[PDB]
Amino acid sequence: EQKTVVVTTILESPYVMMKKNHEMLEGNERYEGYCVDLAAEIAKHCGFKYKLTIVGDGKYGARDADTKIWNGMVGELVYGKADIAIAPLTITLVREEVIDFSKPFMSLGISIMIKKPQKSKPGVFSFLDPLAYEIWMCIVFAYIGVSVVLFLVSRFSPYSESTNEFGIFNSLWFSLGAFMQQGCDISPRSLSGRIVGGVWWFFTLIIISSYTANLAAFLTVERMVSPIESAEDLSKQTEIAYGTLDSGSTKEFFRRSKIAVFDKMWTYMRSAEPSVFVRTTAEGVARVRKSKGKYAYLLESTMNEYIEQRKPCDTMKVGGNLDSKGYGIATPKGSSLGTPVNLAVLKLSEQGVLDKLKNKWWYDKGECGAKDSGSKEKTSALSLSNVAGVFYILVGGLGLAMLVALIEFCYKSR
Amino acid sequence: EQKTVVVTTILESPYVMMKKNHEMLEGNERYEGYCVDLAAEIAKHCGFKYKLTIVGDGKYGARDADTKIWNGMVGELVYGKADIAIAPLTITLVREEVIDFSKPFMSLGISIMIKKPQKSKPGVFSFLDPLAYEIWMCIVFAYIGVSVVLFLVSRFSPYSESTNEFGIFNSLWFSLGAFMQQGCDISPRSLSGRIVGGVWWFFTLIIISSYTANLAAFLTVERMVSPIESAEDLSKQTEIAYGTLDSGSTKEFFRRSKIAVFDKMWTYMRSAEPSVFVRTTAEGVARVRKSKGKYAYLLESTMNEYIEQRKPCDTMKVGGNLDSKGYGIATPKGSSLGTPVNLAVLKLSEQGVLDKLKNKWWYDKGECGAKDSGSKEKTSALSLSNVAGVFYILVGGLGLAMLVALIEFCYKSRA
Amino acid sequence: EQKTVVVTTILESPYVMMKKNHEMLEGNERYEGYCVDLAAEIAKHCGFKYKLTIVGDGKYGARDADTKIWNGMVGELVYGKADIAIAPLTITLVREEVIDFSKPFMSLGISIMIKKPQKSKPGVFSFLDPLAYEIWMCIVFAYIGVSVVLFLVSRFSPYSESTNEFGIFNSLWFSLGAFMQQGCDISPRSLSGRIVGGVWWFFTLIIISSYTANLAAFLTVERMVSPIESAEDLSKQTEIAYGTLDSGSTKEFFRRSKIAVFDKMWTYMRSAEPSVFVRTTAEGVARVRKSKGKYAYLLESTMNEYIEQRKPCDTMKVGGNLDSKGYGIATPKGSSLGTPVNLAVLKLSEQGVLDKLKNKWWYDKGECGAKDSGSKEKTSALSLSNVAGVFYILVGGLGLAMLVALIEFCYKSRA
Ligand SMILES: N[C@@H](CCC(=O)O)C(=O)O
Numbered sequence A: 001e002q003k004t005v006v007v008t009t010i011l012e013s014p015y016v017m018m019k020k021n022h023e024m025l026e027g028n029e030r031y032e033g034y035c036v037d038l039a040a041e042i043a044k045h046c047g048f049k050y051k052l053t054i055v056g057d058g059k060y061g062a063r064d065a066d067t068k069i070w071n072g073m074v075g076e077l078v079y080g081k082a083d084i085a086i087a088p089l090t091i092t093l094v095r096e097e098v099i100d101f102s103k104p105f106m107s108l109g110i111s112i113m114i115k116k117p118q119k120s121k122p123g124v125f126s127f128l129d130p131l132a133y134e135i136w137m138c139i140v141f142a143y144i145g146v147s148v149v150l151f152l153v154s155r156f157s158p159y160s161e162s163t164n165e166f167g168i169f170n171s172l173w174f175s176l177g178a179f180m181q182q183g184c185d186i187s188p189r190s191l192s193g194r195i196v197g198g199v200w201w202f203f204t205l206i207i208i209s210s211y212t213a214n215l216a217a218f219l220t221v222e223r224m225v226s227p228i229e230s231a232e233d234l235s236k237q238t239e240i241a242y243g244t245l246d247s248g249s250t251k252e253f254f255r256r257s258k259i260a261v262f263d264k265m266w267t268y269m270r271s272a273e274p275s276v277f278v279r280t281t282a283e284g285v286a287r288v289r290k291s292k293g294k295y296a297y298l299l300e301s302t303m304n305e306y307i308e309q310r311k312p313c314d315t316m317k318v319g320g321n322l323d324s325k326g327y328g329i330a331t332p333k334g335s336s337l338g339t340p341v342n343l344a345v346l347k348l349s350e351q352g353v354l355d356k357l358k359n360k361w362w363y364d365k366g367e368c369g370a371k372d373s374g375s376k377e378k379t380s381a382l383s384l385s386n387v388a389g390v391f392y393i394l395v396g397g398l399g400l401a402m403l404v405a406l407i408e409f410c411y412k413s414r
Numbered sequence B, C: 001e002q003k004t005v006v007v008t009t010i011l012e013s014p015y016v017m018m019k020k021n022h023e024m025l026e027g028n029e030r031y032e033g034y035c036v037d038l039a040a041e042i043a044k045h046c047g048f049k050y051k052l053t054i055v056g057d058g059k060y061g062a063r064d065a066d067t068k069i070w071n072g073m074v075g076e077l078v079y080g081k082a083d084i085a086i087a088p089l090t091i092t093l094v095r096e097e098v099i100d101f102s103k104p105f106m107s108l109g110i111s112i113m114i115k116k117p118q119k120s121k122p123g124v125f126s127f128l129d130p131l132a133y134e135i136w137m138c139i140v141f142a143y144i145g146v147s148v149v150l151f152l153v154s155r156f157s158p159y160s161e162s163t164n165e166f167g168i169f170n171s172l173w174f175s176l177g178a179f180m181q182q183g184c185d186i187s188p189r190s191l192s193g194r195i196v197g198g199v200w201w202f203f204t205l206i207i208i209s210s211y212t213a214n215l216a217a218f219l220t221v222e223r224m225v226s227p228i229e230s231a232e233d234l235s236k237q238t239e240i241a242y243g244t245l246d247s248g249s250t251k252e253f254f255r256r257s258k259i260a261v262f263d264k265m266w267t268y269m270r271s272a273e274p275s276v277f278v279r280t281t282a283e284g285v286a287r288v289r290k291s292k293g294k295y296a297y298l299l300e301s302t303m304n305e306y307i308e309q310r311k312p313c314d315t316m317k318v319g320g321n322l323d324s325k326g327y328g329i330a331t332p333k334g335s336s337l338g339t340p341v342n343l344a345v346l347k348l349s350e351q352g353v354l355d356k357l358k359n360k361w362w363y364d365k366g367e368c369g370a371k372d373s374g375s376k377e378k379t380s381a382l383s384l385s386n387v388a389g390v391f392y393i394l395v396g397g398l399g400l401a402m403l404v405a406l407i408e409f410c411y412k413s414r415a
C-alpha cells in the first residue's frame, strides 16, 4: 500500500516558510520553500505519497555528552519517528555513524557578518589627491633647483655691472609666478637665462595639463574605510565580541579544531560572558543589527548570501570561506529509500533543476541596490563641503601676512 | 425580399466612434469611423443593404470558464444573433475552430505603455549650474577680504608714504585681474604683499580649474535609461504593476504561452492583488496616467500609437512588438459570404484604399509628431539659446559704463 | 595475510607525476604526487600493503559506442583488473550505476581557457604620444617661419632704423613665449607685425587646446574587452575553434545537456572539421598556446588554476564555473573495502589534511606568482614613473645652460 512517508524538516528561510494564508489553507499548502520544491521533485521521481511534519523542538543538535541520548532531527531519524529528512543538514562524521546520507546537492562554507560601515565624505585636503606623494616632493625639489640655477647664471659680475634685476628673492618670485601660470613683469633678457626659462615653461605646461584632467571624479569618492577585511583580526583584538549558533555543527567544528587561531577563538567563546550564543539565526541577525556593529556572528554562507538580499541590507559578508561542507538527504540506516533517493539527487543535479530552484529562491526576491547599481550617473553641481578645505589655507595666509607685517613694522621703527 | 444584413461591432476608438450629433441623428448616420467606411466599401463591392448594431455587453469575448459557452461578439456570431462582424477581432487558433476569418487587413503586435518622463528645459543662466549657489556666494566675501587685506598691508608706514602704488582701487583691480587669469600690469614687492598674492593665486587655480572640469563633465550626455525594450525588465522587478484587458486575446496569450519570461509575467498577473484588469481600454489608459508611473498597461500596438499621435500626447511608447497577429472580417461557418469578403479585402488591399483610410484616422492629424523622432547623437553643436545669458550681461555692462562716464563728466564739469 | 591491494591511476599533473629519478629508482618510489600522499594516508589508516600501477591506455574511460563495453580506468576496475582506483575520477550518473563512490574529496567546475592578449607598458616619453609624430615635426618649421617673417617685416626701413626692438633674437623669444601661452614682454606696434602676431595667436589657441583635450581623452579608461566569457563568443560565432578532451566526462556532458547554448556548442563541436579533440590535457594546452589565440580548450577549473601557476603563465582563465561536480575514490560494487574508505575521507576532510596537501601542491610551489590581475578602479593616481621623462629634460636643460654660461664668460674675458 502507498504509505505516506513521514517527512521531517525545520522552519527556516528560504528553505521552509509558512505561507501567509496559513490561517485559511490546510495540508501541505501551508508550507512553501526550496526544500518543499525539492521534496516534491524527489517524491515525483520516486513515485510515492508523503506527509509533511515539523521537528518537535526546532533543533538540529547532536548526541548529548555522557548520556548518548540523540535529539533533534537526528533523534527523530534514529528512533524511527520519521522516514526521511529533507533539510539543510550538514554532513559530518558523527552523523554518518548512525544515519546514511545521499551525495551532496549543495556546497557551502563558514562565513562572517558585521554591521556595514556606511560610506563617508572625502577628506579636507582631497584637492591634492590626484597626484602621488613623491610627485609633490620632486616638484618642490625642482622648484628649488630652478630658483637657484637662475640666480647663479645671472649676476655673475664679469670683467660695476648691475643691470640684471634677478636677485635671489626676485628669481624665487619669478619661478613661482611662472608655475602658477600668472604673468610677470621681468624676463631673463640673456641667452642662458632664456634657456633656463624655456625649459621651466615646458615642465609647467606638461605638469598642470595632466593634473586638471581628472578633478571632478576625485573631489567626490563616496566609498572608503572598513573595520576589517581578512576577518583574521577577530582573533587578535577583543573590541568586537562574536559567537556561534548553539546545538549546531559550527560549534562542534570550533570545539574540535586544533588550528591555533580557531582554538584561541573557541577558548574565548567558551568562557566570555554574558552568553555570546543564540538559539535561532534571526535572533543572532537582530542582535548584530542592534549592537551597533560591536558584535559579529558566524553563519553558513548559504544564509549570508540571502540575508544581504533583503531590506534594510544593513549587514554584509566579509572574508573568504574557512572550509567546505555539503548538505544531504538523510535516511534511517539500511532503509530501502537510500539508493533511489541518491539516484534521484544525482539526476536532479545533472538536469540543472537545483540551479533553477536556486535562482527562484535567491535572486528573484532581491530588492536592495546591490542587484543593479551600475548606472553611476554624474553627480549634480559641486557642494561646498567638497571644496571647503581650500578656504581655510586662504584665511590662514591672510592671518599670517598681517603678523609678518606687524613684526616687520615694530622691528624697523625702533 | 432578401434578409437585410445584421452587422455587429464594438464601440472602440478610432475604429467606431459616436457621431457628435448622436442625440439628433437617426438611422445609420449616428456612427462614423474607420470600420464604418470599410463597411461602406464592402457594401458597395458586394451590393447589399445593411443595418448597424452595437454588441450587447462590450466584450470581444472568448470561451468561458470551461463551460464551453461563448460570450460577447463571438457568441453573437456563433449562436445566430448576427450575420457578420466588422471589428478589430484578432485571429487566434481557438476562434478558427468555430468561425471563418478572411485574409488579414492589418498587422500589429503586443506593446507596452507608460508615462512619458518629461522633457528637458535648460534655463537662461544654465552655465552657472556646475557650481552650487553657496560657492558663488562665499567667493565674493573671499574677493573682498583679499582686497582689503592687501590694501591694509601695502600702504603701511614704510619707515616715504608715496613709495607704493597699491591704493584701494588698484588692489581691487589687481585681485580681479588675478582671479580671471587674464594677466596684470603690476605686482607687489613687499614680502607681506607677496605672500598674500601667492595664496590668492593658489586659490584661483584650484577654483577656475574645477569649474572648467565639472562644466565639461555635464556636456557629455544627458539621458534617462528607461525600461529596456521587449519589457523583460517587467519580469525582474515588482516596482511596476501591470495588467491586461478582461476577456481579450492578450490575456489568453499570457495564460497559454510557455515562454518562461511570459509565463513568469502571467504567474505575477494571475497572483497579484488587488485585481489589475480593466473592462475598457479607456480605463487602462486612465490607470496608467493616474498611477504616478507605477503602472503599465499591455495593449495592441495599433491602439497604442493612437494614444500618442493625438492630443494630449502625454504618454510614451516603450519597446517593440512581442509577436505578430492580424485582424479579420469574420462570419458564421454557415454562410456563402466567405468568398466575396475575401475577394473584396484583397481587392481593397491591392488598390491601396486601406492605406488611404489609415492615413485618414491615425496620421492625418499628426500634430505632435513634428521633429518628435529626435536623435541619439552625442556630438550636437551648441545652439545660441544656450549662451544668450552671457550676451545680455555683456550688453548691460556696456550700457552701465556708458552711463557712468556721463555723470563723471558732468561732475568734473560742475565741481 | 593482508593480500596486496592492486591500486590503479593515470599520469596527470600534479595528481601523479614521474619522479626525477625514475630511471634509477625501484618499487613504489618512482611515483610522487598529491594522490600518492593521499594513498599513503589511507594506507596508514587501514594498514594494508599496496602496489601502484598505471592504467594501460591513459583514459578515464566511458561506455563505448552502444556496444556496452567500458574502456579505460572504469573498464580495468569493473572487470577485476584492479581493486581500487585513486584518481580525479568525476562522479557521474552513468558511473554510479556500476561502481560505488565515496563522498567527494574536492570540488570543481567546468571552465574555459584562452591565450592572454599580451600587455603594453608606457614608454619613458609616453607624454608625447597623445598628439602625433608628424605634427611635432611640422610645428618646428612653423615656428622658424613665423620667427623669420616677423624679423624680416619689423626691421624694415622706417622711412630711424633704431625705432623698433624686434631684432632676430627678440623675435625668436617672442614667438616662443607666445606659443607657451605664458605672456610676453612686448608686442609689435606696426600693422604688418600685428597681423603676423594675430595669426600666430590663433594657431596657438587651436593647437594647445586639442593637445590638452586628447591628452585627457586617454586617461579616462584603458581596458581590452577580450573574448566574452560564459561561452558567449564561442556560441555566437565560429571565429574561435574549441573542442573537449576525448573520452571524458565533459564530452558526455556536452552531448547530453539540453541547455540551448550548450546544445549549440555541442552541435558545433560534433560537426566542425578537422578533429578538434585531443588525447591529453598537455596536447589541449599546446593547441591553445600555439594557435595564435584562435583556439580554446574546455577543462576542469582545478586544472586551469594550475596552468595559470606554471611557467611562463601566459594563459588566462575566463568566466566562472559552468556547473558543480566532485571527485571520489571508487571500488568494485559490493566489495567490503570501501565502507572504511568513506569514513577515512571524512576524517581527513575534518582534520584539514586535504587543505594542507592542496596548499603543499598548488601554493607552496607558486613560483609563477606574477599576480598581474590588477584592478578596475578608474581613479588611480599618477605614479612618478609616468612623469620622469620630464624631469630628465628639466635637469638636462639646466645643465646645458649652466655650461653655456662658462664659455660665454671665457669668450667675454678673452675677446
Ligand atoms: N547545518 C548545520 C546548522 C548549524 C551549524 O551550521 O552549526 C547543522 O545541521 O548542524
Ligand SMILES: N[C@@H](CCC(=O)O)C(=O)O
Residues within 6 Å of the ligand: B060, B088, B089, B090, B245, B247, B248, B249, B250, B251, B298, B299, B300
Ligand atoms: N484584439 C483584441 C483586443 C483587446 C486586446 O487584447 O488588447 C481582442 O480581440 O481581444
Ligand SMILES: N[C@@H](CCC(=O)O)C(=O)O
Residues within 6 Å of the ligand: C060, C088, C089, C090, C244, C245, C247, C248, C249, C250, C251, C299, C300
Ligand atoms: N575529470 C574528467 C577529466 C577530463 C575532462 O575534464 O574532460 C573525467 O574524468 O572525464
